[PDB]
Amino acid sequence: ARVTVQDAVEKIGNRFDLVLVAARRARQMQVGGKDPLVPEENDKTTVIALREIEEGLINNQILDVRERQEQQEQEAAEL
Amino acid sequence: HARSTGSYSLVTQQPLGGKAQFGGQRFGEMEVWALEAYGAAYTLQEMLTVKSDDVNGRTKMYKNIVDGNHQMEPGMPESFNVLLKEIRSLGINIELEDE
Amino acid sequence: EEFDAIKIALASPDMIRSWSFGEVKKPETINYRTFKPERDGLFCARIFGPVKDYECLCGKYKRLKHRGVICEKCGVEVTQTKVRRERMGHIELASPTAHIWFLKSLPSRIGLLLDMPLRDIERVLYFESYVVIEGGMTNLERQQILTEEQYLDALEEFGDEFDAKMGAEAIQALLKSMDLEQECEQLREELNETNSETKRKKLTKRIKLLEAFVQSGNKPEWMILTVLPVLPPDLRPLVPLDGGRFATSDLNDLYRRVINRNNRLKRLLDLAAPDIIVRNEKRMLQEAVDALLDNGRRGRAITGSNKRPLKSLADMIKGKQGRFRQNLLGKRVDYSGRSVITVGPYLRLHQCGLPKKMALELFKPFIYGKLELRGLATTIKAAKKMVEREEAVVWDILDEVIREHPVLLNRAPTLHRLGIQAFEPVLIEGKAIQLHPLVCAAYNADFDGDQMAVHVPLTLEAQLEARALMMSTNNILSPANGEPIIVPSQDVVLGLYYMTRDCVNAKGEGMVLTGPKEAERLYRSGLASLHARVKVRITEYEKDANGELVAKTSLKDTTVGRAILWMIVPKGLPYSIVNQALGKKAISKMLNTCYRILGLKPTVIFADQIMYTGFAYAARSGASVGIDDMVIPEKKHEIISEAEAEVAEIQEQFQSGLVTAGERYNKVIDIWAAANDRVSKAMMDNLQTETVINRDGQEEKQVSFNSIYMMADSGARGSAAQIRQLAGMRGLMAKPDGSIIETPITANFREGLNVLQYFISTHGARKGLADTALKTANSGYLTRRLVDVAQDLVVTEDDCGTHEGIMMTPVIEGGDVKEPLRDRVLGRVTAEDVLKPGTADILVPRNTLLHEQWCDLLEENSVDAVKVRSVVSCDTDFGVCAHCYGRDLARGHIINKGEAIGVIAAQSIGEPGTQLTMAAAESSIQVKNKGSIKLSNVKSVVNSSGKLVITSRNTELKLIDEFGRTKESYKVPYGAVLAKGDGEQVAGGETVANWDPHTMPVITEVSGFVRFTDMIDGQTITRQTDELTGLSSLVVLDSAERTAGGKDLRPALKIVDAQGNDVLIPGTDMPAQYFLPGKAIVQLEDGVQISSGDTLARIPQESGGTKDITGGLPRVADLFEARRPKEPAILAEISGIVSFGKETKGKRRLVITPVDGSDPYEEMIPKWRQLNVFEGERVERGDVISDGPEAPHDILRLRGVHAVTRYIVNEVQDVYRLQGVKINDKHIEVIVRQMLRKATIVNAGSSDFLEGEQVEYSRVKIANRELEANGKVGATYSRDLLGITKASLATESFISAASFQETTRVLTEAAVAGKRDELRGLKENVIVGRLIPAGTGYAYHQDRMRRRAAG
DNA sequence: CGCCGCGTCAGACTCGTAGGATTATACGACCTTGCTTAGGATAATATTAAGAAATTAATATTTCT
DNA sequence: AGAAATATTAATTTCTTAATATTATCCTAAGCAAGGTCGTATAATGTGTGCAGTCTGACGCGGCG
């Protein structure tokens, strides 16, 4: 979270992998513009990414599946 | 003393003011070792390319910050291919084996 | 854009033309009035591009529209000005010249290829003597020098039939004329036929060079320059300074010379000059090109008008100031400020103060973007105006942009990774950064002017890294050892110590309190003193099975202060942690217990709470320091006068001649040391407990409340030594040569020193101060060498599936158990299944992480030797695995894949050193504890005196316990009387072996007669015959102390019976003949037969000086360099039987003949070595023959890899442990791994016979070739040990190798090798600005690996 | 076999940082070059008719309101 | 009368061509100061770096017996 990221590390299992996943999600929320899954609570997108990973709402597989779902739906909207 | 952006040196194209805004903080070898120790590859990469030498990188990333997008498009530092020119001028053919 | 590898080769002249955009034809730079680039000159705009963006010189084509066009009036191309910085030129040399790098290198490459002594080449090149390029005549051969008159003669006989030339034209003809296949095959075929070692290595050089040139694609001719490239002008700027003066890079001057001289030559060849003048011109042209390429390597360095030498091309890519070390590995950086630091004691561990002005200047583009977004400034130009005006909305935007934005604080020197930590800013009104006190220790920061650099992580990944990897609350455990580095340092520890202490009778003595809360209420109300013994009910919690905290309440017998402090302690910890004096050690250990029981978050909160309450109660105390707090012992004057009288007496015993000068010295220094220790004891008895306190009316002495004693006792600041200098006499000083000044400084700082006492003190003061100044540079060099060795080692797997590794046992050096098993095993992973004292009882399926629970479990049992997977024995090829490493010490768990352990280890080893670089009788075996006895490395016989004889020098005494845990190891000398034997139940306080401290004896193992043979009088001794009792002045000494008279006199004594013939040592037929060692006295003369165990030769030893072992930093540097150890302890290279051969040709011959093996192997050993082995004796491989330091190379070659790694780990550890510095062993093990990286091949069928190879390449080959590809056509290897600097230079990547040392040599080698590096090490990727393959960049770089897999 | 004495080259790291290397120096005379006057012929090029017609914005009915 | 819709003069853009006068390229001839080379006839015929303070330790390596 804000002070310690231990819970996120136990949820992913690797400091480095946690950084990569959290950066991907924060990029989604900062540029991609999509809404957070936890309340804002006046935090920078980085910390919302960490908080979401703390609750198990965001895992690398979850990010992959959401991205694939949206991309396949756009490809369906092509036709 | 502080610095966000200012003068840049002539040959190496790397931070060095001094008149009003002085040169940036030197990020020496020992600190590169410290970041390698932490495993922080992205902080290192930005402290090598877009904060110091990468010209297209430095300006593009100032633009990105002003837009509110925090992202890096890093290239190759100026000092590296200055080194390539200086080695090439010793009659030694050093290149970059492209893909 | 993306490339993969970097290739170096030699630049063909056609290729140098290919780079170039036009020939430079003139030495003209710019015009003198217009200051515009001149045609064909060094700065020409036609060649190197236009001077302004999209403008020709003549301004005809002067806008973007006309880009790409070449203005016909001036020839310039309308393009960006940046191409002045990328376009190169070329000077067409009017005569080929030699490339100095490929000629004046220490291993000349032109001289190797041609096989012509460098002197002969220098003679040909300097136009000093001809050489035969080629001769049809037979008397003259190729590469045969023909001096001038000899050339004239040879021309006279034949003339055209032989071609002989002078200079670089000749050398180019020679290089061009040789055929590489033919010399390759000839050298290969004639290497084997006459395989002399020096000739073999020379031919190996020649051959490897020839295949290098065959395979690389280079050609030899390209050594010789005929077209010389010219650097782009922006890289050698000529720019106007303010005053109107210009500033030019020295290359211009150097370049000018070349062109000038080149042009002159182009003219002389037209005027058909006398060839003496043309020769001189060619000499100067060669000299000018050489000064261009490398001014230094050129015998005389060309200096400019400054008179200091010009900086050549090679001087810019080389050295500390070169591109590599100064602008390519470490750069200046934007978004970074710095300032003085101060304490923020109100801070939390993850917070740093940050001045408002500094944060405004650092975060400026963020503010611009935010102001534009809020609409407060729809214009960046007006946003700058608002930021400069400093409106009150700028500050709100700043506090909004700085929230949750970590910022890295740095302090130089950055000795270890905890020197750059990411805090989270708090904006403060000031100009000094505010640092949390608890994080000073990691920074080594103190607030007396230190300054810290502030760096802003910009991108989003950088922000998450600084929050998740570097945040100050993640780094609470050191990465070197596992101990915490959030230790409450000095004021907080005195506060805790003052509050958790006690008194005999104070306010509130023995009342009962209902808990900690009314303890606090009583203290605040002023009804009870902070430390007054009391009964309080407390309800402590305990994490039982399933991690549930069970509440148990009781009525503890504590003080008020400890009850108050219990309120800050987290649930899960016992009250015992608070029911004590709580010095520094106790506080750090209670933080350890909090971390181990609860985790990271409660530990961070607990550390902050400890800091606040320690500061608060330290301030409530009123702790000062007065001149009355330093109490001189009331009995110091008499001690001083007693020592004065004693030195007067010893003076009278010196004048009377009774004592010598050297003996007076040691005795008087001893009595001064004794008086010093008595005064130290007197003061520490007058301090530590002098407080007499009333209890029920009667006195009761307790521990003192002296300010200085408390500051020394809590561990806050100082120690008994400094207190000793404050109140007791400050001991003896040393002269600037190490000689302890005879008389000591008898005064102290409370009385003040005399003039001489102060002057004497100054010698040591400046010695220590200059030592500290010059000790940091050595430590920095050691850290640098270690890092460059260990760079590219990263955890790369999860389990190599390896078999067992190292065997781990406590280091017990005699009485002291230097290091126990729990500290040598904690965190590692078991090499294989470990069994309890009851056999076949296992806790581990061959590998389990030994954490605190398992360490306690195996301390329940008596196991004292565990097999542990170790890095040196990993099966992983391009790195290590996550098991063979063990525990990530800082994070406290198994180590994450992709971490950079090499840099961690290098910094852990190199961080200390900056802070601690640096009677003797040995009577007998005084066992200190009860236990059994076990003897090792001795094969003796029971004597006639009831004891055991001593067959060999390796008598290892091992004290055991009743629990089977060895507690003492000794080494009794060969021939030292030993009282008891083996298996006895021996209690302590006894001597089990016997010898005087000045006696290293050697004993007859049977009744022995003296036979006067080979101790022959006249040639080694002088006969001074004494009585029938068997006395004399005979002194027998080792080979190192034998005169030149005794060549056929072997120093010994043949042990024979009363019958006369050789009596035998019990158990042998080889005659009893103990060749008695050095410094030995023997008295028995002919007609004497003594007991079976009565001494011949005793070796007195006094061990005077007590400083005879190297240590500190140079010892560790020497260990890691793996240097030769002066005279080495020779080992037994092959197991077998050894005898002697040719006598003292200068060296004896030791012929080692196995029971069944290579019998004719022998060795030559000088006349300085006393052989523990006898004339002929059967010995095992890797056994001591002569004595001295062990060369590690031999240890690896003869003993196992585990043996040499154990040797190195133990030696360097001992050096550290001596200074009270603890460093987990994994670090030394990984550096030892990086030493043992190369192998020299034994067999063949895969590659060459013996040449150096990477052992990972050989293991991969055997894992490919000696698998089902072939039964065995593979090649075995000899594992090689290599010094750190050599190993770091023997890197397969020429950018990493070229980065740090011998840049010129490495680059020259890479050029003639036609090498390429694929950018795998961290350094390589730091240089080219990529993502390092460690940590966070690992996931990226493995993507590139998989894409390399599929094309 | 075992030295042994020649060069030889990088020696850890962050901050600012004034003054800096003399000597002793010919006149014409073409010849060319690199930049300036200069002198009208056109060539843009800014303005002026012009009118005419077209709204188009006012003027003045006159019809509701 | 107070707007509330209508017919008239009347003030006014808008093109348009021609036009009409001004004005500004242009371009080549020529000119002048600046920059480059040659030519000098009493006799003259070999050197300055003007030193350099043993760093330095291995270490390569070429010898070197």
Curated annotation (Swiss-Prot), chain A:
GO aspect biological process, one term: cell motility
- Asked if Transferase is a keyword of the record, the answer is yes
Cellular component terms (Gene Ontology): cytosol; cytosolic DNA-directed RNA polymerase complex; RNA polymerase complex; transcription elongation factor complex
Highest taxon of the lineage: Bacteria
Annotated catalysed reactions = RNA(n) + a ribonucleoside 5'-triphosphate = RNA(n+1) + diphosphate
Give EC number(s), comma-separated.
Answer: 2.7.7.6
Question: Quaternary form?
Answer: The RNAP catalytic core consists of 2 alpha, 1 beta, 1 beta' and 1 omega subunit. When a sigma factor is associated with the core the holoenzyme is formed, which can initiate transcription. The rRNA transcription and antitermination complex (rrnTAC) consists of RNAP, NusA, NusB, NusE (rpsJ), NusG, SubB, ribosomal protein S4, DNA and precursor rRNA; S4 is more flexible than other subunits.
Q: What is this protein called?
A: DNA-directed RNA polymerase subunit omega
